[PDB]
Amino acid sequence: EVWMDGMEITQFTYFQQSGSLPLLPVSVEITYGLERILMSLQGVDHFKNIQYTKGITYGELFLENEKEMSAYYLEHANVDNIQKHFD
Amino acid sequence: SVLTFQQAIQRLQDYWASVGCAVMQCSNTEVGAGTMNPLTFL
Amino acid sequence: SVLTFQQAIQRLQDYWASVGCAVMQCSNTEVGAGTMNPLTFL
Amino acid sequence: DFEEEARSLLSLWLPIPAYDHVLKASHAFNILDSRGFVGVTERARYFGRMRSLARQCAQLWVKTRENLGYPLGTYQE
Numbered sequence: 001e002v003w004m005d006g007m008e009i010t011q012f013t014y015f016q017q018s019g020s021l022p023l024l025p026v027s028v029e030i031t032y033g034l035e036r037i038l039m040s041l042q043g044v045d046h047f048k049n050i051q052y053t054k055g056i057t058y059g060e061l062f063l064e065n066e067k068e069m070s071a072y073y074l075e076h077a078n079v080d081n082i083q084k085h086f087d
Numbered sequence: 088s089v090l091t092f093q094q095a096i097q098r099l100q101d102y103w104a105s106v107g108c109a110v111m112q113c114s115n116t117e118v119g120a121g122t123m124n125p126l127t128f129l
Numbered sequence: 130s131v132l133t134f135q136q137a138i139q140r141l142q143d144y145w146a147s148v149g150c151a152v153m154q155c156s157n158t159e160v161g162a163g164t165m166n167p168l169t170f171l
Numbered sequence: 172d173f174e175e176e177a178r179s180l181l182s183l184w185l186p187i188p189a190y191d192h193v194l195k196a197s198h199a200f201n202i203l204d205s206r207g208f209v210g211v212t213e214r215a216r217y218f219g220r221m222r223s224l225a226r227q228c229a230q231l232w233v234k235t236r237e238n239l240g241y242p243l244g245t246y247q248e
Contacts (some may be wrong), residue, residue, distance in 0.1 A: 018128065031121055034095055042089050052092045053151045060242065061153075065187065072188055081172075093152055101139060110135055115159055156192045161201055167190060171232050 009037050173199065179223060193228060197221055207234045 002010040015027040035058075037052050048059025090098075100110050114124050122128065144154050156166050164170065172194035180189040200217050203209050208219070 029122065029127070032099070034092070038090070038092055038095060050092055051089070053160070054091065055149075056151055058092060068185060068187065072185075076183075078176075081176075093146070097139075097143065097146075097152075103134070112155065117155065117157075158191060159198050160194060161198060165194060166195070167187070171186070171190060171229070 004040065005037060007034060007040050009040070174220060175225060177228070181224075181228055181231060184231070185237070186228070186235050189231075190228050193221075193224060196224075 001008050002012060010033065011029075013029045015023055015029060017023065018043065027062045035047055039045065039047065042050065044050055048057065048063055050058040052058045052061060104110050111126065114126075116126055146152055153168065156168075160166055173192050177189050177192040177196060180192065200209075200221065
């Protein structure tokens, strides 16, 4: 994993199993995370201040989706019409 | 000035296209990570 | 040269990013058309 | 099931998931039409149900956003 100035920003992996059968040839996986990078490159401590484009902020797009999908996944998710859908 | 959130993408996915990677789109099913998308597990 | 498909997007995004539009990601659920997206109807 | 879930969510003043369920409800009708198991009399019923749900879901977003003071801006003249 790649630390830029103390922050873990990226993971970097060579694959060797997938499913249950070994790999041939092996793959390289690089996975950037683009909100832990932008807070460092911009001097911001709370994601809802990240500048999305010139004029609009990240909070002012995804805040209420962050706020009221939490109430769904956390309190009001009907929990038997999911136990059936699983099977 | 500083890099905004969409310029980060608009530069990452053109650099990695100069190298030679194909640039696909995301899926249309909810996933928890990226390494389980249909086109990096299969 | 002849235009390719993966750079027509790069020319149609960096243009509308200069007029003032804010480019975003695609839909999440299977949309039957291009209008029913929650980013346009609501 | 999706129609009823959308109605129940809309009754609780939750606009975004309520409209999200409408898309996956309207996809099922199209996939039913593709197979060919929808008659010529149920078409009107399906269209009426879907349009009623969409109409009663749309007029909730405007009522939800007005209480926040319109942070983006306001248009005049």
